[PDB]
Symmetry: D2
Subunit: 485 residues, 4 copies
């Protein structure tokens, strides 16, 4: 379509009149997010992100809305879009455009391009607008990314400019791939150096998620990582708290809002048992489900068995499982042949990445019929067997599609890491090369201590003899770099 | 307020057009409810309930619609009303008026008087409409009650018609008591034998929850139970499953939809540790919460400590609690002095009974300012401390007000008990005196069997020598009458 | 054998020199057994049990030691025998014979006829020794019993006396039945009226375990209960604590002493999900095990599924099970054919009753080879499959045979029930008929309160208005009598 | 002032050789639970990779270790063994080891062992020296397998005092073990002036089993006093995340249950430290229904603690009403006499970490409290001024091993599998290794894991050619980046 404009701010959301509801919820998230509020007070005078022009691509939720206003509290200008077609919280997007001090007729916030229920075409357009700053002599100079979509637009964009052509999409490529090229091919017809000029301008990217960090590795190994990158995902306080315990919280929320199906007493299959696999399984156990897991990695599999779970393959467990949940971050986990053998009215969901863990393209062209129950709940029925399957969020993240994603105090951790990673890549750009980096242990321990204190946990303080005995400083770090917690 | 009437059906709901949506979730729900679906098969030809005119007072949820259409499949005529002002699922209510083979233009289901977010005046108007059948010759001849507001309206209704006067409300009476008395008083100045006529027509009551069953004990003690009552609550497959595992599910959902407070790592105070208290503590402990309990009973209290919870008074733990849940079925549990001691932005909710476990009158009278966040969530702020708390559903059942109540498969237990109870009191009425009964053990066992079979469990069968050793029939019952499971 | 006699106390134990070790652990246990130490204090001056001559059949442990010495503190005379051939803890029996003030040279305690590792013959000789008081004018006038063996001697012995003959055993009879029949026959020669005299003298029996109480229920239905009986098993503070939270303690101890098998990660099969079964499953799940349950009762079977356990048959699960535990109180659970199907080096144990849950006579006669590894551990090998299984305590109670049984504090609940039952039946004998009984709610509540105050927990006291709301006294009882906790 | 037994060419010193029939029974049973070790015997039998190895071992002398020992010898090694703790030796295990699968108490056919449960500190360091002192002066120890770094410390400190030419006088205020350690090296330096230096030349590598052992290994290295290559066995994922945590979940319960008859559920339990060993302690108690609080110095460990449902507190604020207190820090001075005086009457105190210094046993024994021994490794300590008593397990030394029998077999299958691979690699590939602390590669860590998964019956998924490609891993693994924390 065409961006909305109002009082200096271009944007495109569902409804600005939701801003008042949003503001109330933001204000409440603030009291649950000490990672960001503590970062606001510390960096208030310094203004470390001044000059920064951050293009962000992360689910547009209340929690992100508090992160965005942490970045502007520290000097930055931002533009934003979501990273899933279903995860935008519309009242959040609207509080963000309107700002703490504006009204919907006079918005005083930041540009936002997101709404719940985008098509694939609307998602890539919203993307483009987030990356395309209004003065051509001042492009995006930082990226905050989730799952690697922004970075993939710029780096593929550039790689097709440099080559003078965008390749025509093969028929058997995702329909999102067809859409992605169309955006660049149509852009290239008019502007030949657009993504090149943005790439050469961006001083670093901070990436939130495991799947995004796998893409960052494939760019650096091919030699195309065109700017420094921080792996925020693998901070101890991100991966072992947001990936695991945010999920222990929000799988349950996703499933309860989608279905009115009992968890306890049912057979649940969790695919993959990494940090997201771990949390899915612990929530289900705690609700008294009969859990089984799949894994490729014998270490991760031995962990499952020790925590009380059968390790099995999909084809062994599929036709008896009541609830099936993919959490591997890999493709082609649950296929049409598997869906076809699922019990009647079994629940299928993905909590990992994109929509390729579950074979959605195969299911659509199989001859099953779909009845939409409500947004992001669809019942599919096979005429030959008579059996039906409930599918959540069209195979895309069910905790963000069917619910609200992880609670506020969990994102306080993940986003404290994101704020810290932006400061260090902006103010210290000189010390980093075009490779993937992780934040030092002290910064990880900084963030955790904030939350330990907010919870009321009373840390023991080492004596001088005890620090000497351990080979550590009283103030930390307390552990070796390889330490696994 | 006047009832709507299409194709001979009087009703008052939120929106008929929601029926399609409702009907889709009712069909899904029938697949989750083997207990009720078994009973429709079994008694289809017998029509055991032909001639029944059942007035029901019970949360008008999707689970409850599956029940109502069970009673009608078994031959009954029913009229319905919710028993909480927040508990109606308007799409459920719509599906029920319209019936499996009707449409909103030509509905073919049953009279319903129910919408989400009724006022106290609308609530009681509804109950009267539900108890008042079209033909003054054919009143209600059966009651289905959840909490005892249908039984109270009839039994007190007749008490005041006999005294020849409905007393004034004292100025300190509970607002619902005054609203309730205003109903009986206004009916009496036009119709002086109304409640006596229905009370003498009513062949029996089947009662759903603990609180309702206590009322039934106090009417029977005072000589004032005018009809047989079955205590469905204390069916084994109801008390130990609905109250415990149902709540383990639906406590989480309520807090998740109301807030985005993380549960893991948080200090949670459960008040009361009977079966609702036992579900609440197990839901929270499985999400990582540090739980403590309050109890008056030394036995329940010793059970709590043996499952790893501190047993404390509200006085000593209120200031530290991140979430406070009241689950006692008794009043005066969390007083204004206690709300005022709560940490800034803590969560207060009740999952027990009515609205008086929490001092909601005192809170509302106190001078505290209320800001409404969204439906059933309010933030209250004290200008003396500067602290706020979040209160869910105005102090009323949080699981059915903020979310949707216990999930379907649980409610197949409760409502197969309720159907079985209505078949018994209707068809064997001669055999019952005017007092409180509980169902026979073999009936509990038959209910549970359905559910074990549906989930896929395999029950062992006793040989003739083991049945003999045990002193039991191979087909049960298997336990002494005092057995506690 | 011939009883030993020193300082006028007849006895027969393993080694009196253990008394010293015995006394320090007895004293240790007192600090852990509030219910018994409180009763000693309350009824100190009263001396309620003066005149009592208590013949007790109960596992001769440090816990029981504490009981025996409670009953003597309150006035009674006692004589004791274990109720399991392997349960005696010989240092505890030493200390009971020597008494708190005696020495091995000059004992000042009570007659004990117990050692660890008895033969069936020694077992029953010990039984008759404990029931046979020195003075023919002053027989036993009370029985404290666990499993019903002492009651069985008196009542069957009295049956053959009134009939004039003790019958022949058939070659089919179990080894212990033929030894039981042997003892009574050999006595009917020199003493025609021994047991009739004791039945008439016995004022009542108190019975500690589920299986004992079944035996009593069967004596009452056959019109043969010669004296009142108290079912201590089915006190709330016994069944719901000892049967379940004691087993959750002692099942684990028995397996760790018998073997060094990891529990975590292994498949476990628990036969029976009553109270002992519910505690077994709970132990294994908190240690990491993959637990499945077998059951005949569909209610108990559905409680299992809701706590995260498949309900399965022995036929379908026996070959996958690393540990098999029987928890039924029924005979014929694990037969020869099931043992032969067990995987190599799997552990078989029984925590229920006697030794016929496991087909131990089938095994012993099968052709299999036994290597004794150590006391109460044996490896049995099938020359035809070449597989070996480990059998704990020869199929008798694995928690008392291989370990020390339930811990001190759990037994303070069960044994304060027992002391209270003995005071009731002795000092208030007139109020009890010749049928089976359970203690009054208030007496259960008294027991729980003692142990709740000892653990640090704080009960809330009902206000006068809250007590009326509920229709209970501020001091209780607090629950209806069918109440299930 | 004590000298070895010698029979059939074996020198040794144990409790009772007549316990060998019993021990062999338990050993064969343990083999069925240890496929990590049984797998390596099969893979490497034909090749015999440890030929020429003469391994001095200092690791608790348990059934579990017995299978380790008899695995190292199936692979060609010669071994001499002693326990690393004075209370952890299982006598019947020591016997079956000396006597071998095929010998007899009169004609033993196994390996020298210097170990009995309940050694004095003089007998511990004497057994250590023997274990390290091979019969042929030409051929001393050429490999170490150590647990907590006591063997490594004798060799390196021994050496250090030979080169300064004086074993230094023990202070007035030094741990009684330190006084006993020096006294050993000073009596020997009289009659042999280059004993330890010759051994340190001959030792080609050490493999260290435990977190405290590795702390000490890190300190020698920074001193530039690490004389030989060292493999950090503790820090494999399959040792650290399965022995330290899930082993302790099992055997903490066993220690407390054998020591006392105290119910765990319902009680207030306090765990100091929340690393791998602290996390297993907590999980065990939780699952027993305990009311658990933890202490921590590290805020990351502390936040994990709270997310699993535990108050995070200090000793001083929780000590007064804990029913059970367990230290798992591997750091010193956690429970001082002041804390002990504050504990509830008949409360339990134990140590599951290291040595004897987590708990102030030196201050406790000099305080005027009186001691009554209940049974081995159970002592009741009573304070005259309060009337109060505490139960102390294992004199403040490893309770899982002192009061019970250590981790179950299937748990050690993982640690000792990591130990057997460590020894193989450091012997057959010694030239690749500098004098530094080293960890094993991920594929060896996944190979150990795969052995046990498959024993337990877990069925892993196999990646398609396209799946492995997307992840950028080979089908056969490794599956995870090197920073990955599991
Ligand atoms: N939805 C959310 O809120 C959320 C939060 C965090 C991360 N994530 C996403 O979840 C996914 C998992 O991330 P993680 O942090 O757990 O990663 P992880 O690397 O820790 O775990 C992935 C696990 O999947 C296993 N696996 C891979 N292919 C498999 C297959 N075919 N079958 C079975 N197992 C297989 C791997 O062995 C690995 O252990 C990623 O896509 C990540 O982006 C989602
Ligand atoms: N060892 C101890 O420390 C200890 C403690 C308490 C009780 N007990 C003994 O334990 C036994 C059980 O006691 P409880 O109170 O748990 O019993 P319970 O009556 O509550 O339950 C026993 C369960 O076994 C089930 N059952 C019966 N036959 C079966 C079969 N063939 N297969 C599967 N399930 C079957 C029944 O359905 C029942 O639920 C009794 O014999 C009791 O005397 C032992």
């Amino acid at each position: 379509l065409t961006p909305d404009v109002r009082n200096g701010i271009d944007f495109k959301i569902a409804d600005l009149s939701l801003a008042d509801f949003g503001r109330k919820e933001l204000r409440i998230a603030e009291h649950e997010m000490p990672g960001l509020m503590s970062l606001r007070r510390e960096y208030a005078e310094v203004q470390p992100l001044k000059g920064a022009r951050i293009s962000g691509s992360l689910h547009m939720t209340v929690q992100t809305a508090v992160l965005i206003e942490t970045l502007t509290a520290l000097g930055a200008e931002v533009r934003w879009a979501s990273c899933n077609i279903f995860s935008t919280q519309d009242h959040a997007a609207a509080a963000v455009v309107v700002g703490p001090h504006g009204t919907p007729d006079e918005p005083k916030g930041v540009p936002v391009f997101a709404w719940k229920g985008e098509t694939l075409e609307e998602y890539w357009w919203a993307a483009e607008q987030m990356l395309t700053w209004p003065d051509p002599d001042k492009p995006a100079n930082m990226i905050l990314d989730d799952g690697g979509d922004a970075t993939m637009l710029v780096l593929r964009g550039m790689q097709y400019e440099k080559a003078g052509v965008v390749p025509p999409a093969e028929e058997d490529d995702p329909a999102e791939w067809k859409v992605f090229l169309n955006l660049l091919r149509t852009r290239f017809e008019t502007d030949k150096d657009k993504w090149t000029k943005i790439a050469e301008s961006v001083k670093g990217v901070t990436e939130e998620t495991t799947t995004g960090v796998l893409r960052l590795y494939q760019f650096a190994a091919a030699g195309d990582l065109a700017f420094p990158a921080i792996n925020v995902n693998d901070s101890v306080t991100k991966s072992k708290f947001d990936n695991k315990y945010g999920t222990r919280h929000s799988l349950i929320d996703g499933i309860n809002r989608g279905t009115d199906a009992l968890i306890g007493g049912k057979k649940v299959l969790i695919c993959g048992y990494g940090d997201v696999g771990k949390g899915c399984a612990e929530a289900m156990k705690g609700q008294g489900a009969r859990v089984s897991v799949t894994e490729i990695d014998p270490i991760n599999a031995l962990q499952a068995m020790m925590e009380g779970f059968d390790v099995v393959t999909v084809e062994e467990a599929i036709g008896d499982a009541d609830i099936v949940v993919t959490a591997t971050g890999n493709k082609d986990i649950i296929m049409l042949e598997h869906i076809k053998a699922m019990k009647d009215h079994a629940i299928l969901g993905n909590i990992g990445h994109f929509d390729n863990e579950i074979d959605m393209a195969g299911l659509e062209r199989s001859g099953a019929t779909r009845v939409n129950v409500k947004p992001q709940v669809d019942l599919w029925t096979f005429g030959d067997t008579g059996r039906s399957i409930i599918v959540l969020s069209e195979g895309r993240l069910l905790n963000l599609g069917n619910a609200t994603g992880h609670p506020s105090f969990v994102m306080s951790n993940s986003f404290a890491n994101q704020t810290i990673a932006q400061i260090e890549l902006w103010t210290k750009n000189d010390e980093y090369d075009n490779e993937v980096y992780r934040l030092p242990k002290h910064l990880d321990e900084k963030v955790a201590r904030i939350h330990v204190e907010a919870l009321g946990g009373h840390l023991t303080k080492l004596t001088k003899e005890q620090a000497e005995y351990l080979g550590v400083d009283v103030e930390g770090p307390y552990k070796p770099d390889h330490y696994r917690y």
